[PDB]
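Hello,

I think I submitted the EHL job twice by accident. Can you confirm which output corresponds to this input? Input:
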Amino acid sequence: GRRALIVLAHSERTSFNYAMKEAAAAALKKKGWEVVESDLYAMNFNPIISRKDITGKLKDPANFQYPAESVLAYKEGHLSPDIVAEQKKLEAADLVIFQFPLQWFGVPAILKGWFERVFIGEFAYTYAAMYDKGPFRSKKAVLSITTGGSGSMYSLQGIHGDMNVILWPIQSGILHFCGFQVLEPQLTYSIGHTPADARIQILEGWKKRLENIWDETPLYFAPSSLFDLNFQAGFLMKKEVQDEEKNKKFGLSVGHHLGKSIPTDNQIKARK
Amino acid sequence: GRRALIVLAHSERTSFNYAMKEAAAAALKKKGWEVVESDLYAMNFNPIISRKDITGKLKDPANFQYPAESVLAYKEGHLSPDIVAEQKKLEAADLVIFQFPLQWFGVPAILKGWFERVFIGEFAYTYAAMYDKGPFRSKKAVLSITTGGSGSMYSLQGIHGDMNVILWPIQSGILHFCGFQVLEPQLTYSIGHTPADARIQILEGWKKRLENIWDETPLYFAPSSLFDLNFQAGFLMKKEVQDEEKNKKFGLSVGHHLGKSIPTDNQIKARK
Ligand SMILES: Cc1cc2nc3c(=O)[nH]c(=O)nc-3n(C[C@H](O)[C@H](O)[C@H](O)COP(=O)(O)OP(=O)(O)OC[C@H]3O[C@@H](n4cnc5c(N)ncnc54)[C@H](O)[C@@H]3O)c2cc1C
Ligand SMILES: Cc1cc2nc3c(=O)[nH]c(=O)nc-3n(C[C@H](O)[C@H](O)[C@H](O)COP(=O)(O)OP(=O)(O)OC[C@H]3O[C@@H](n4cnc5c(N)ncnc54)[C@H](O)[C@@H]3O)c2cc1C
Ligand SMILES: Cc1onc(-c2ccccc2)c1C(=O)Nc1ncc([N+](=O)[O-])s1
Ligand SMILES: Cc1onc(-c2ccccc2)c1C(=O)Nc1ncc([N+](=O)[O-])s1
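Support: Only one job matched these inputs. Its output is below.
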């Protein structure tokens, strides 16, 4: 791997998030990487999917259906140029870093809208190649999140609940849906209550970690081969896998907890 | 109850989501509700938080920080008028219906931004009044979600994983965190793959449910009294509560699964 894309979702250049992006860019560059940036607020990026993402006539403007229409525009080269420029940043990149503050327990609206406008069907997924088969299966993505709350509020017994459940919709439903290998999220908690000397260390540990990031082991998701990938089956786990798993104590995943215990830190720690 | 707010996040009046919003409005109006709409697309609602949300002079424009500044603005009456207009709608509402298509395993960006810009500190939550003590604790919220994928994809063995995990960050982290009593979601699956007759039954089903919605039992979240709500303890579950829970087979909820089995449909079905 030699190209990295840094997507940043923060309005302030005075912010620690911005500093985390700057630190990632410096470390990667110093290590031989090409780094490309998507500073969404600085790009004044438009996060609202609409029929203006299609450049030209619509297949059915009286019954406008965004996924069908946008897939068709992608095949025919009729996507709004600001989408196309992002899709090509993705195409080029080996590594993708998402640097954002956690907002209402997910990504800022500006970055959520980035997924909805840029991760177009066919380009970012098809139903014939989902999850570990996805188009991005050669790429690696990592979430670098800062929070207001403290680590303990998001421990199994913290008031907010398991961070691993909060991460699941993003890391499995978005990134890994499209084929990304997801690395362990960089989680920096209670950043607005961290003394100056700690913030400095946080930025050093981030830069240190990027020195070898491409070698890391990604999170575990259940492989798509465990499932009957057709409607007649329901995209349910294969009968013989269900059987094999009745014995087992743990679910496979946050999402595939199977009513049993969730493997510890499934969405936070790769398998040691 | 008397007053309903319906927030819709869909660009097309021809969509089933729009029909769901029309149905909800008629059903509640016929039973004597006042009903107000926030059709985000028709409003062309700005979904990006920024310094522009604070009309007038900032407290520290040299280090803009949105939580403190927006809260100050709220207390001093300097929130941008569109924000303020939606906070008014919310104050008057007893019931809030969120009608949206599921997009990348959460809410459309336009609704994510609506939360971010409208659920301001002090207005929508305090350090001192989180979750079941929250400012909206007299109000009831419900999610009305449509999906492309089908129900079995989101069952415990569906390839997508437990829908209960997907709902957690929204229903607990956003609605309940502000004090809402969260009612069972209205989950209409594979709506693009549903014949017209079923479609009409879903609309009628939804209207029939809305005839007694206020009398429904809300979803279960761990009460905040089970937690030491202070930084000294880290907002960890109280000692006596952990002990007493060590002998229980199920966790309390999706977020507080405490490494055990998650109680079935904790986020989809109220407790019997
Ligand atoms: C709408 C909204 C929703 C939110 N929802 C949640 C939620 O669900 N959960 C949650 O936990 N939090 C939530 N938050 C809080 C949010 O996660 C934090 O405010 C955010 O993570 C802080 O990031 P920041 O970089 O802006 O911090 P900043 O305050 O911008 O930066 C932190 C400190 O680092 C300093 N700094 C800046 N640059 C550098 C540098 N180069 N080197 C060293 N120090 C530097 C700054 O001066 C500052 O003192 C929410 C906030 C908003 C606005
Ligand atoms: C960016 C994006 C991301 C997405 N992510 C996901 C995801 O993560 N998971 C997922 O499951 N899905 C996802 N989807 C799919 C999405 O959930 C569905 O495509 C959407 O719910 C379709 O609903 P609709 O309101 O647009 O109905 P339409 O697709 O517009 O139409 C549905 C049917 O309802 C009929 N109808 C309309 N009005 C009425 C009426 N009044 N009475 C009777 N019939 C009527 C229409 O004739 C049509 O046959 C995504 C879609 C997009 C664009
Ligand atoms: C600190 C801090 O910074 N941002 C947030 C936040 C803002 C919006 C949504 C979610 C989190 C936050 C915080 O979590 N305060 C409270 N949560 C647990 C506490 N309690 O139990 O009382 S105090
Ligand atoms: C149908 C349908 O409609 N919208 C979506 C969707 C679009 C973006 C993100 C998530 C869902 C969708 C769908 O999920 N098809 C796949 N589900 C499991 C399948 N598999 O395992 O192969 S095929």
